[PDB]
Design a binder for these strands. Structure first.
Lengths: 88, 218, 129
RNA sequence: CGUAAAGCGCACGCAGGCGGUUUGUUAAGUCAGAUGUGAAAUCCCCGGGCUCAACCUGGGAACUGCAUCUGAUACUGGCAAGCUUGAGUCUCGUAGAGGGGGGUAGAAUUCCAGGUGUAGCGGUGAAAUGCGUAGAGAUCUGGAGGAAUACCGGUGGCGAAGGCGGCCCCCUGGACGAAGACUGACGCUCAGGUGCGAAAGCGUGGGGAGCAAACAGGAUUAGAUACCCUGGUAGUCCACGCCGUAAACGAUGUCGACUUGGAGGUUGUGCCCUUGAGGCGUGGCUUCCGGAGCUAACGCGUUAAGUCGACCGCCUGGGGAGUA
């Protein structure tokens, strides 16, 4: 699911450092990466509910990473959604 | 202090938590007691029995297992205080008012059978009283002399005689128990780490107690 | 999730006293020793010592007159659910006044019995008996 | 609040409540002293006055408060800067009836067509219904279908819960362990809200072997709108919608800390001798028995009903009624 190579590009273009595995904006980006893909399995296969519970985890969890950022570095949050085209 | 190679530590894979201080652990999943925090311990055990012993004490030895009984008998009437080796009637102490009356049956028979009243009846019928004499001798025999109530109740085990601790520590008679690394010391007054299930060890304990008991008499 | 660490620090003793432990440890914080400062200072718990530079974990040593605990009772009061502050003139007595109560003044955490005679009072934390 | 009344069936989650650790700061909460206002009578305390009393009455205390000034700064909050245990991301593997889709194989069931061949077959406590000389049942050969996956299979595993089982492939969720990396409290819970949610049932449309509500027939019985027997519609099966209730039950809310043992099971991983089915650790999950303690008892017992802390839900006699 978004295999190792697919991952590395996200951190790469969201690189504060090589092994910046854990910065937020990287995560949100990965979250974005998988979710956009995941709507590929759910366009069809709509009845696949069990997977849905997992998809929900990511979205909402990603959201929780949003609000942490906003109240911690608006320059990061504001640069972010405007480049990852968020907010419906 | 290691005068013997059989007291060292034994009894099980299934220990009992309350036996935690005094331990080494070896192969076969058998604990080996830490004799180091044993030797000092029974010394005052040996000592404390003596102070009341020298005060013309009333010491009880209780044993069972048929492989622990003999040494006790060999050691208690050795010169002095009373013992019990066969199945000790649960209640010889906390209900001694009733057991005491039993001895009147015994002291009768014990005398009658050999010079007194044993044959003014039919042999098989007169036989029945004989068994009762042995039957009384078998269990109650070791207390006949006791009278009143104890001053101390030395024992070999804690579990196999679990009925002692809950009783002896109920009228308060000071007990002295060699608890295996299996038993529960809770009620025992002077908990002596050691082995029950041995024989060369137990006659050492008896032999250990046999010493100062022989001084107490005064 | 471990929202009242002091409650926990109170908790540990009551349990350690139950199981005849010898010493108990915890993620020691600035506050935790302050309470510990008192407890030892009045003699309910034997000596404390703290090791650490990144994981400072105090080890409070208990105490026993007999095998029974010496802390017959201990009780977290000021809950994060419910802060309760009492005035100088409002300070209660615990165990006819012989059991002590740990209160927080503006002179630092200190037994009410001594904080009473500092002439002021504040947040009550726990009791002991 | 396991069984007595009472943990929503389960999950995500906004408001709300609560929050790890370090330093500085601020002074909201908190706190000390003071100040003003807190009407009197009434209540209380020592008095006093009617012969006493009730009653009157002097003086004090008190009126648990509110606003302001002045500070105290532990704790709590705001704000600023951190830190790593909480939490989360990546590197690599491992196990799994997790979920959806699309193929597929064997066994049997009934059916239908042939060959053979002949009076029963089926059934029951004993019968009859029914099927059969227009030739069954039996056996052989073959085809057509539908639904379920023996053995493996196990107080095994997986999933939030409902639930999940032949094999294969594609799509896809979660979990666990290693040695490190990295963000640096990003948390815990959550009325309302959203979603899921056995079975039976509803609606539209496909299927229909077996099973089978309803119903039919034969029996049983005193009667037998049943228990039994022969059949049999819906239904169950598939798709898409719907319903949202169940003894949706470990009758045990969620998260977290702590608190003596024993014996198995399952699944990772470190080491010693794999020197030979091993021996010694370290983690996840799980089964029975059990100690302190707890509970009304029964029992729970490191996965507590023990010891606390955060948040929610819920109870307040029986029937009436889970009804109007």
């Amino acid at each position: 699911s978004l295999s190792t190579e697919a991952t590395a590009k996200i951190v790469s273009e969201f690189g504060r450092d090589a092994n910046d595995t854990g910065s937020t904006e990287v995560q949100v980006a990965l979250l974005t990466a998988q979710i956009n893909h995941l709507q590929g399995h759910f366009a069809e296969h709509k009845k696949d509910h069990h997977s849905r519970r997992g998809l929900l985890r990511m979205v909402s969890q990603r959201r929780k990473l949003l609000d942490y950022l906003k109240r911690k570095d608006v320059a990061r949050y504001t640069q972010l959604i405007e480049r990852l085209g968020l907010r419906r | 202090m290691l005068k013997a190679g059989v007291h060292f530590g034994h009894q099980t894979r299934y220990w009992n938590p309350k036996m935690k201080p005094f331990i080494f652990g070896a192969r076969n999943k058998v604990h080996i007691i830490n004799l180091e925090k044993t030797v000092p311990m029974f010394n005052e055990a040996l000592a404390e029995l003596n102070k009341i012993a020298s005060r013309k004490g009333k010491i009880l030895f209780v044993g069972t297992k048929r492989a622990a009984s003999e040494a006790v008998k060999d050691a208690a009437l050795s010169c002095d205080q009373f013992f019990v080796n066969h199945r000790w009637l649960g209640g010889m102490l906390t209900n001694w008012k009733t057991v005491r009356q039993s001895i009147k049956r015994l002291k009768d028979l014990e005398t009658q059978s050999q010079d007194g009243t044993f044959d003014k009846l039919t042999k098989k019928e007169a036989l029945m009283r004989t068994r009762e004499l042995e039957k009384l001798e078998n269990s109650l025999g070791g207390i006949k002399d006791m009278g009143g109530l104890p001053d101390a109740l030395f024992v070999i085990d804690a579990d196999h005689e679990h009925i002692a601790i809950k009783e002896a520590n109920n009228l308060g008679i000071p007990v002295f128990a060699i608890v295996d690394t299996n038993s529960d010391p809770d009620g025992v007054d002077f908990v002596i780490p050691g082995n029950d299930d041995a024989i060369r060890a137990v006659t050492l304990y008896l032999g250990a107690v046999a010493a100062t008991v022989r001084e107490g008499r005064s | 999730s471990m929202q009242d660490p002091i409650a926990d620090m109170l908790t540990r003793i009551r349990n350690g006293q139950a199981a005849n432990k010898a010493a108990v440890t915890m993620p020691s914080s600035k506050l935790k020793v302050a309470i510990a400062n008192v407890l030892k200072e009045e003699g309910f718990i034997e000596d404390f010592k703290v090791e650490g530079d990144t994981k400072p974990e105090l080890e409070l040593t208990l105490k026993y007159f007999q095998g029974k605990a010496v802390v017959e009772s201990i009780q977290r009061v000021s809950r994060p659910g419910l802060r309760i502050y009492k005035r100088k003139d409002e300070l209660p007595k615990v165990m006819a006044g012989l059991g002590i109560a740990v209160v927080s003044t503006s002179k630092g955490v200190m037994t009410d019995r001594a904080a009473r005679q500092a002439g002021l009072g504040g947040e009550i934390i726990c009791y002991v008996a």
